[PDB]
Structures are given as structure tokens and as C-alpha cells.
Amino acid sequence: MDVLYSLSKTLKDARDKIVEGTLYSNVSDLIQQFNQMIITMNGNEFQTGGIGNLPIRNWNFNFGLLGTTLLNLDANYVETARNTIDYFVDFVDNVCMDEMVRESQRNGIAPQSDSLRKLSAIKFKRINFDNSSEYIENWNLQNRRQRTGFTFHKPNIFPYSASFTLNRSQPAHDNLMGTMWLNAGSEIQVAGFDYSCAINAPANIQQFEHIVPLRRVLTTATITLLPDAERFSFPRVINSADGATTWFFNPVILRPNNVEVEFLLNGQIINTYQARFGTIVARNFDTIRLSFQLMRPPNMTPAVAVLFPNAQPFEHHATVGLTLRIESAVCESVLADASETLLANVTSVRQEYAIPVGPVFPPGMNWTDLITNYSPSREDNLQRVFTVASIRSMLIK
């Protein structure tokens, strides 16, 4: 695993530094690495593929060393090295696709393919080169039990969920109370409603609350908070809880009163913010607890006072909502986000070669089903496959 990154690092540098006309002292230490790759790899033989429609290929290495005697590199020296690099870079593609496609349930952090088990001998350890990427540095710190961290831009921490809750209801569905929400990606939009507009509430104030637990602990997040749910603002018809009938929701929107956002960790309040919108921070949390309340306005112009009567026909329903959005955070387990394409490389290999459903991952690599039940057996497999997908992205985009 450490020597699979070390093969790809000095094939990336060999296509970049060994160019025509360059001075020899620029590449004097790469060629000592590239010659010492070849000496270790000669005489061995490998075999990749076999699962699904992934074809079986056999690999055999018998190459010669590079020359170490020029002052400026010429077109003979480049063209005799390109037909050696192009055989190794085809070998690393078929080892990385052989490993992203396999999985185990007992110990997923171990190598699973036949070729990567064979590269983990002490014979092949002399190919080891620097480990400077983000995923190979966190592969080594976490293997010694030291603290790691991945930096994300808009991480997919919330599974998709769109539902509601009725705290007061009747079969006519004309005097209701409760909340509605959408949790999707890295964004929460909750909105509380009350059809009577707190005409009989004590002190004309109705209290709402919405609690979102996370799956993993986030660290040093940057969060944007805005006092409107724009998705629950228009008239719509909504089905019932069991799909029997439908009910109508015609909102008018007040401002949210007495907003309190809390950031919990094992039930302890780490941060809190009271009527403070814009950008906020959250240093360590795993549970977000939103709290906001509706207050009936005590003074109303004649255009407003017609909307909220005392009797039963309520044609304009009051609505109070919020909107939260995580911009960037630092987690310790691997996730998906909006910047890098490591999830897209894993699913595209499995979909292309028609791979059967195994014992660990959901069918079709569904991210909503995978972050919902994000077991420690799935975490060790998901890190092992995102790290191999990161090695393949250096050579083959």
C-alpha cells in the first residue's frame, strides 16, 4: 500500500522531469530512484483482474536501466524512457482498479487483491519514496494511532430527508401546528408553522424546536445562518402521514423570534448563539439543536389584521423558518464533498465492469444509504478504497 503510492509518485515525476533538453543535474536524483525501481521489479510476475467483467491480464517485468552519462538530455534519452514508463503506468491502473472493486467484512483495512498482497513483502519495501499527499499522510498517521484530519468543502454529512411533524391535528386538516424540514447534503432548512397564529397560546408565543444528530464529529466548521426557509414559503398540497388524504398549506411569513442555535458534544453545550445571523463558527460538535419561536405581533395595521381572525376559518397560515449551511469543516473519517471526485471514481469503476453486490457496501454505492448506517466496518473499507482512488488520479485522470 505504501509501495503502491511510491510507484505512482516516481512515474508522475518521470513524465514531468525527464523532458528534452533539460540539464542532467535537475534529474540526477530521480534517475537513481527510477533505476532502483527497475532492479527490484525485474524477474517478478503478477496477475490482475478476474471479478465481474474486468479482464485477466498477466504482467512480466524485464527492463534495462537508464543511462547516467549525459549533460543535457536528448531525444534518444527521452524516447527510450517513454516506452518503459508506458508499461508501468498501465500496470498501476490495473492494480488500482483491482483494489477499488474488492471488499471484505472482517478486516477491510488489509489489502484484498492478489497483486497488492504480493507487493506487501519486505522485498518490495526499497521502492518506498516520499509520502506527501493528503491521503497517504493520513494513512500513515492513523496506522500508528495518531490524530488525523481531512479538510472538506461542503461535506455530505446529512443524508437526504424531507418530512414533517404535526403536533396538533384533526381529520379536517384546518388547524395545524408543527415543523417541516429538508436535510440534504450540507444544508438544513427547517420551518415551523401555526394556523391560529398563537391566538390562544400563553402570552401569544408558540415554541418550536428541531434537533439534528450527526454521524461523525466535525471540527472547526464555518457555518452560515439566515433567517428564512425559502423552500417552505409557497402554497402547496401535502399528503397525509399514511398516504390516505392530502392537506393544504398556504403560508405567510413572519420573522423568527428568539433564535438560539446550540452545538452539542456528548450532551454538553460547546457553543451557543442567540439572535446572531451571518457567519458563525463551531469548534467541536456532533449535534445541532435549533430553537426558535413564533410571536403574534401586538400592533397591526388594517391590512394585516384581516389576515388573522379569532374564529375558525384561517385562510392565511403563519410560518417561521431558518436556514443553516456548512461551508467547510474538518472531520477525521472520510466523507464526500463538493470539491474532489473520489466518490465518483469508485462508483464509475463498479458500474462499468458490472460488479455484483458484495457484503459491505450498499447496492449501487448509494451515499444516502451509506451515511445512514455508517458502521466501523464500512469506514475501514471506505478509507481503503478512497486512498487507492487517490493514487490512480495522479497518473490517469
Partner: protein, 49 residues
Amino acid sequence: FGMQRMHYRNGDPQTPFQIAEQQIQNFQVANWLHFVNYNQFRQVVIDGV
């Protein structure tokens, strides 16, 4: 080329041809100096020997 003397230390890690290929700007002289620097054998087992 009008340069000064070498002023060479006994026990230099580099031979006098090796600190000469980086000073001389002539292409035809210096790539001969580079050939003499990195010239060695090749160990090949021919017939078991």
C-alpha cells in the same frame, strides 16, 4: 577560458573533473568531462559467470 586556478582541497568529496563540468560553459568540452565522470562497468552474468 581565462579562469583562475582550481584551489583544490585534499579530501574533497568530488573529483576535479566533477567541479569542472559545472564551471565550464563550453558544450563540447564539458560533455566530454561528464562522460569521464560517470563512466563505469556493467555487471552481467553471461554464462553463469
